[PDB]
Design a protein around this ligand. Structure first.
Ligand SMILES: O=[N+]([O-])c1ccc(O)cc1
Ligand SMILES: O=[N+]([O-])c1ccc(O)cc1
Ligand SMILES: O=[N+]([O-])c1ccc(O)cc1
Ligand SMILES: O=[N+]([O-])c1ccc(O)cc1
Ligand SMILES: O=[N+]([O-])c1ccc(O)cc1
Ligand SMILES: O=[N+]([O-])c1ccc(O)cc1
Ligand SMILES: [Fe+3]
Ligand SMILES: [Fe+3]
Ligand SMILES: [Fe+3]
Ligand SMILES: [Fe+3]
Lengths: 305, 83, 102, 491, 491, 305, 83, 102
């Protein structure tokens, strides 16, 4: 027969924890039931199209761990606390926008800076949307809810950056209406040489469907490149051109970027518990770095022109 | 002539404003106080109602008037029963 | 005045927490952060009176652990409806205490 | 100064580009995107009618949660658990168990769109959609969590989707079909339009009315706040549908709507139906299940579907008959086999209740009332062995819910069967069979709980073996009559 | 990075300077400052034990309000007004009327300190104090405002302090004496120490316990949140007291404490006493009034006063006897003269209630029970004229509340009178007379409501004339028995 | 007898409003019962000390109006909405502090700027506290609750500015520990010539006890002077000395200062409904302007040194 | 030999799994179904219980075995009473 | 299907407002901003269903006036639990409407 048991202080799966479960533990852990049945991720025909997709692109990944669920966001962010934090940061950025616009900041930038922004800044909305799309893919494919949650928040952060860029592209166009701001970004993304390395990188990255490769290429290769080769040089250029708003804006975006790197590195540490994974991760890094390096070189050449 | 006093009736819970007359006997004052007390918050009882200055040991004569008593307006009196 | 004297001659100190999400975590925190003190709790539904003899400490670190979410000590004011004892508060903890022994 | 959203919104969704380093089909594979061959350029006319932007979203959503949590905190001592009718507590248990982890699964449906939809506005609204469903899953784990210490059945708020309990399988078979198991456009139509504008209002607002009558404001306030998010992200479906119709895909769009609405209906008939007409105390029934269906599904949703240019489903008249009949039988089934549920079903057949049922469903007493007559007699004569099953119900190969009909005076029951690829399947309606035939590769090798029992996958082959298979970990977790049969004291 | 408050806090209160263009006494006049001759330099050792800073204050206070308002919003349909016992609704009416505009008056007490205290930390904490009381006044106007449309008695949440109604005069005579009518140091001692650490806990937390039992969470949540502010700004008093004692002003400090505590006691005995032991339904009485006094005033406040180095008041034993006795009579007075109140007093003397009273106050039935016996008999024989007054009660020249004693078997009543400057005054206790004698210029030309009636200021000199004078604007606003005498049906 | 009346939709005193009463109307209007009885403001002996004070310094003011209660804060701020607004502005300022400290802003100011701040900035805590004290006085004396409410919020804003100054004085001292920052401010306030005009102005202003004169001197004379002669020149100096934080900080403080001026001007407009008041207000302005002008001249001479 | 069928009993509300034997007569199958229905959700009644393939018009002979019937495992049958 | 046909053939549009501080102000706003439309209200305690025939407008300015505090149109989402009709929303107003007439 069964045994008679008393109520547990928390979920059955957390009941063996030494510590009192946190808000994060309670609402984040072990929620992907799709990992329970290896033959049938989803409650359908075992060979339905999505079941075949998941068996190939998740279950069969060379990146392997016996307990992905044990992963922990080092920031232990939940929906509620993410919104508190980002309402804080975003209110701050919107306040900067208001105040700098009041002081007519855009009118005092160095001669010609509007053209540098039109060419090198405004088309970032395409790059950032690609990061958004790619983040959502890692979300839907990752083998633990704690991993996917980090990806959800990162997808949102990517849209945050896109939105910053959209707002400032429009705002800049108010002072500089003859620079193609808000008009020529798709053409630049599609045709300008400085954007082609980035575009090639992202189109290919968006077609790496294995969850493990998607994660490594996105979070360990592409995103760190953007920080060092796009975000920071833009800050330096802005400084040389009396744009004092852009460095502050980018600093807020960099806070998000460092958070993405923090959870990514924590996932790597978890993965490396399996020694086999070092060769796997390093292999994917070596595979994508050439593309990422060419993307950065081309972008920097354009920025320097 | 109107003459305000503050009166505490035996076994009641408070002191009340009762306006008597300068020429009332203690028997009458005792009646005018009782009106606002007996059968309202105090059970009726046998016995002669007497008047005394508040917390005093001396009872006023029943026939004595408030004029003859020397009481001043708005002074406090008790209405009690002979023991 | 027997009853009154006995009520006066106590050395109970500690927080009164209003009904809400801080009640259980504060009780647990009082127990943990004051080992070798008996913690008393009187439940009045709208508030809980939590006490120890002479001194009762609540640390931010423990409270954060028992509450289960990020917590700054100054936030306790949201739910600290009263207290017994004199108070000494900083970023790391609150201390409820008496100078005298009655 | 700040510039108004209307002046910069278009730039937030100006994100489509012409792929050069991979092909359009490589970037948006049909099996994940579901664009039905419609080129990228056509998708740019997609115009989400309920917009938001990142700064507003985080600010607004912060306010929504602060209210939800503050109300929960202020009401912890209202003695809801201890003082509520046990039928209401069971309502909470079945809600949280059937919903919480499914909400989290819905993040994946939104994610599928955020990556794979060809419409730029859909990819952005789906991003807020991912966030919304994350909120919903976390709220609906957080809220019941405090009750774990009181009652192991509340563990199922988390455990249900991890189990093979029959209702969890019915929930998962449905959500994996409409949410996580299909391409982005199918998600837009089946999830955001059909399910999220159509049926969820029944469980998150219809039920909220009953919860308010029951004096459970923590719960009513919670689910009504949740539905404010639904109302926004559900509006991704309509513009997708309008675009498909404009691009010559009306038949394909209509079929997906027809399929999703029927699948949703059968699930809600077993979850929400018994709750509204039986578990919720009579005094707290704001309207009957049928009345709420007529308000929310017929009066509101169906009229909206017509407005958008779609047609009433082919199965309309079957649907209406079903609203009169199905849940009364689903309820009877859940209750008789209560021991396999993770909540405690209330029978809901005191004389006062049966008068209400007769009023809301003329003829009820000469139908279901006939079965309840036998059951009640057994209970009054303490023949309790006759009020517990010694065999399995036959189960639908689509809905995963027992195969039922109308009992009593005018008995009628029909099973709709199908031989396919050397296997015999059984369906609880014409529409369920039709759904299977619309996409056999989705379903053909799925085995329902009874198929598994017969195949030898459930050992031992007994009630205990099945209960263990379904994930029950103690006596206390298995369902019992909500009032321990105290209702017979009124008969 | 950010630097911790401890590293920069001292600079926020480094604001004392040596005046050069006006004198120290011109800048801090004794009549407004109350520094008792203690030089500026000595006041710099003032150290507020419960600190905050501007950024934390606005952030924290934003969170407190969001919860208070969210709970109110979520519970609007809980039928509290319609379904609550009318004794509980009357409790709400007397609270909001007696408190709301007094809270706003407390802004002025805090303002008096913010400008006129010589202690820099006191001036800053008083600034947050001004803000706190603004919050309290606004909350306690906002909350009852929705009930205006239901009941004109709720108008008194705003109107009371604008009236000459007897209880409003008692409230104003007290608050104008301890809050708005004295120097900054007197405010620190009488308001923040005595009243705010001492008595308010009874009305804002003691009552909150009863409110939670009564199922009124909007109200219990409101007042308990309010008291979290009190707990912080009340802590301005202790450091002032410690400083006075260190500077040789112990006697002066002790006298102010003794005075403020007695004045506060008489007001709470008429407001909170009847609420706790009579208006609140028996089933909702968490503890008796005396029990709450022993918890909050004796066990907590008095022990804290001793800890700080002060002495028990000279009137200690009188105070304890009073706790056993006074409110039972104040209640009887408020009820018999209910028509002059803006709330509807509940008699609270059903047999079940009288058993509770006898248990909580042995001997009650042979005392107050004797009067209630006569009253009840009249009600059962429909002699209603005998349950309404035809004269004024005699009123205390300090507390402004009727002069009472112990009725029944061991009748005892005492009035404490005083001739002063050719006028005769009457006091309801030894302490009230003592308070007058401590500061005659504060009180000597004040006339209480009965003094005014006798002086010809109330016309006509009848019950109607008095009711009009007190500000009643319609029949509905005047107090009646809470249950319209339905309680006699239990006798 | 009385009449029988039905419930009113709002307070009896608002019931005749055409419009539905706002949150502001409901919680702000006609709360000073102390104005009801001219002989006895407070419910005490008519000649008690505070009753005498109010009869002289409020009731007998030459600034007269038959309906001060009708005054309306043009911003219609209540406690709740003040906190929302200021949590927004203050979060923003604290975010600036954090970010500029991260970027080591203070280390990059022009040579010697720390000494200008020590002398001309840090002692502002005394000036701002005087504004705090003075604001509280107008609060307690004003003849309408709607007026007093504006003063309460202004008292709080004054403490906000003080607190900004305290925090930055300490923070600056971390980079420049040998400039007397946080050590010598009282001496400067008391002894430095550039501060003596301001100190004389405030000591005298704090002893103008008539409510009307207190208001005019504080809000129409002193506070506008601070804006034009202290706040804005400090912004110009900071710009010349590569202090980019101070101008942003002061801009946030100026938002408060303009709000104080808005309600003040609205009170004046209300007062001017009585033609007699023009001569009264103008007389008080002419009386105090000399002091305010000398205060500004001395401060500017010091700042320019 | 074990032989699973799905059976709907007259006046009941559902179809149930009932495992019969390859060699059972329709009379016996009808009995094994009734066990899970009559006196549980269906009132007992006079009359001969008959078996028919689901929704069929033809009744199986009472003596016929499931082997002789040609029914396949897991096919659906009704159990009804002669009219 | 008589009952069903009649339920389907309606042209009711408008907001469903969840229980809270927006219920009465939205009702009042619907009446004011749609003069010459009859506004219907169905009270289900946890929510209120507010409707007009064919079209129902809610303007930010009117809602702000009826609510009695500063209000941005986007905030309505806090309490807009569902709606009948198609929706057209901007910074100045929301419009609930049908394209067809049934
Ligand atoms: O799976 N579920 O139960 C759900 C999924 C999505 C949603 O919006 C509501 C409920
Ligand atoms: O109700 N059901 O669907 C059930 C019930 C019991 C069982 O063993 C299998 C399925
Ligand atoms: O009722 N049930 O779910 C059952 C009954 C009997 C059995 O052998 C298996 C399952
Ligand atoms: O006057 N009052 O009623 C008050 C005043 C101040 C306070 O903190 C509470 C109540
Ligand atoms: O209770 N009281 O203090 C009162 C009652 C009635 C009255 O006319 C005057 C004072
Ligand atoms: O009861 N009262 O308050 C009264 C009674 C009579 C009277 O003439 C005046 C006041
Ligand atoms: Fe959801
Ligand atoms: Fe949803
Ligand atoms: Fe207060
Ligand atoms: Fe206070």
């Amino acid at each position: 027969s069964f045994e008679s048991k008393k109520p547990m202080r928390t979920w059955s799966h957390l009941a063996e924890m030494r510590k009192k479960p946190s808000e994060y533990d309670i609402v984040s852990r072990k929620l992907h039931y799709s990992t329970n049945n290896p033959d049938s991720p989803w409650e359908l025909s075992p060979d339905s199209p999505m079941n075949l997709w998941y068996k190939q692109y998740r279950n069969a990944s060379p990146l392997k761990h016996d307990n992905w669920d044990a992963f922990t966001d080092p920031d232990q962010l939940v929906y509620r606390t993410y919104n508190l934090m980002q309402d804080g940061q975003e209110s701050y950025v919107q306040s900067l926008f208001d105040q700098f616009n009041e002081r007519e900041h855009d009118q005092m930038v160095r001669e010609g800076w509007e053209h540098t922004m039109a060419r090198c800044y405004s088309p970032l909305r395409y790059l950032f949307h690609c990061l958004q799309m790619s983040s959502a893919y890692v979300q839907q494919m990752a083998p633990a809810s704690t991993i996917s949650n980090c990806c959800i928040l990162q997808t949102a952060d990517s849209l945050r950056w896109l939105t910053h860029t959209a707002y400032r592209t429009h705002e800049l166009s108010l002072t500089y209406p003859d620079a193609g701001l808000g008009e020529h970004e798709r053409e630049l993304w599609e045709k300008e040489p400085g954007w082609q390395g980035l575009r090639e990188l992202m189109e290919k990255q968006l077609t790496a469907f294995d969850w493990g490769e998607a994660f490594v290429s996105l979070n360990l290769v592409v995103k760190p490149m953007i920080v060092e080769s796009i975000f920071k040089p833009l800050q330096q250029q802005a400084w040389e051109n009396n744009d004092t708003l852009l460095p502050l804006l980018i600093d807020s975006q960099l806070k998000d970027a460092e958070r993405h790197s923090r959870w990514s590195k924590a996932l790597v540490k978890h993965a490396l518990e399996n020694p086999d994974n070092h060769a796997v991760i390093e292999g994917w890094i070596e595979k994508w770095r050439p593309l990422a390096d060419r993307a950065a070189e081309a972008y920097l050449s354009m920025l320097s022109s | 002539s109107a003459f305000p006093v503050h009166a505490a009736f035996e076994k009641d819970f408070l002191v009340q404003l009762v306006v008597v007359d300068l020429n009332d006997s203690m028997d009458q004052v005792a009646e005018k106080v009782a009106y606002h007390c007996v059968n309202r918050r105090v059970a009726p009882r046998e016995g002669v109602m007497r008047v005394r200055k508040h917390r005093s040991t001396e009872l006023f004569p029943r026939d004595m008037t408030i004029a003859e008593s020397g009481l001043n307006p708005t002074e406090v009196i008790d209405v009690v029963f002979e023991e | 005045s027997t009853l009154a004297d006995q009520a006066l001659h106590n050395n109970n100190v500690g927080p009164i927490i209003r009904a809400g999400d801080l009640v259980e975590p504060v009780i647990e925190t009082a127990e943990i952060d004051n080992p070798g003190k008996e913690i008393t709790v009187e439940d009045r539904r709208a508030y809980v009176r939590i006490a120890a003899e002479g001194e009762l400490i609540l640390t931010r670190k423990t409270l954060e652990e028992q509450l289960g979410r990020p917590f700054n000590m100054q936030e306790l004011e949201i739910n600290l409806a009263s207290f017994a004892g004199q108070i000494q508060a900083d970023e790391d903890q609150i201390r409820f205490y008496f100078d005298k022994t009655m | 100064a700040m510039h108004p959203r209307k002046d910069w919104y278009e730039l937030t969704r100006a994100t489509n580009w012409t792929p050069s380093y991979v092909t359009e089909e490589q970037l948006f594979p049909e099996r994940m995107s579901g664009h039905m061959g419609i080129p990228l350029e056509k998708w740019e006319s997609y115009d989400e009618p309920y917009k938001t932007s990142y700064p507003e979203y985080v600010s607004i959503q912060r306010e929504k949660d602060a209210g939800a949590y503050s109300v929960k905190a202020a009401l912890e001592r209202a003695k809801i658990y201890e003082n509520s009718d046990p039928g209401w507590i069971s309502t909470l248990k079945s809600h949280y168990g059937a919903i919480a982890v499914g909400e989290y699964a819905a993040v994946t449906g939104e994610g599928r769109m955020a990556r794979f939809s060809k419409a730029p506005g859909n990819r952005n609204m789906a991003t807020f959609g991912m966030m919304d469903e994350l909120r919903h899953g976390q709220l609906q784990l957080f809220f019941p969590h405090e009750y774990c210490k009181k009652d192991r059945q509340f563990d199922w708020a988390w455990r249900a989707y991890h189990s093979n309990e029959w209702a969890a399988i019915a929930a998962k078979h449905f959500f994996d079909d409409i949410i996580t198991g299909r391409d982005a456009i199918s998600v837009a139509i089946m999830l955001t339009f059909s399910f999220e504008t159509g049926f969820t209002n029944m469980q998150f607002l219809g039920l909220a009315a009953d919860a308010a009558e029951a004096g459970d404001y923590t719960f009513a306030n919670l689910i009504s706040s949740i539905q404010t998010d639904e109302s926004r992200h559900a509006q991704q479906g309509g513009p997708a549908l309008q675009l498909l119709i404009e691009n010559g895909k009306r038949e394909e769009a209509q079929k997906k709507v027809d399929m999703a609405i029927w699948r949703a209906w059968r699930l809600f008939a077993v979850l929400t139906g018994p709750v509204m007409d039986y578990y919720t105390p009579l005094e707290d029934r704001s309207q009957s299940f049928k009345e709420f269906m007529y308000e929310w599904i017929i009066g509101q949703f169906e009229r909206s579907l017509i407005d958008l240019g779609l047609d009433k489903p082919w199965y309309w008249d079957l649907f209406l008959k079903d609203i009169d009949e199905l849940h009364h039988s689903y309820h009877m089934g859940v209750w008789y086999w209560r021991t396999t549920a993770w909540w405690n079903p209330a029978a809901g057949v005191t004389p006062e209740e049966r008068d209400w049922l007769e009023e809301k469903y003329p003829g009820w007493n000469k139908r279901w009332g006939r079965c309840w007559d036998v059951i009640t007699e057994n209970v009054l004569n303490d023949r309790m062995d006759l009020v517990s099953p010694e065999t399995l119900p036959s189960v639908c190969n689509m809905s995963q819910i027992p195969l039922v009909g109308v009992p009593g005076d005018d008995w009628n029951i029909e099973v709709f069967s199908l031989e396919h690829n050397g296997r015999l399947y059984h369906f609880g309606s014409e529409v369920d069979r039709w759904v299977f035939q619309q996409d056999p590769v989705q379903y053909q090798n799925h085995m329902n709980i009874v198929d598994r029992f017969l195949a030898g996958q459930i050992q031992p082959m007994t009630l205990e073996g099945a209960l263990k298979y379904m994930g029950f970990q103690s006596i206390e977790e298995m369902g019992k009559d909500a009032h321990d049969f105290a209702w017979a004291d009124k008969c």
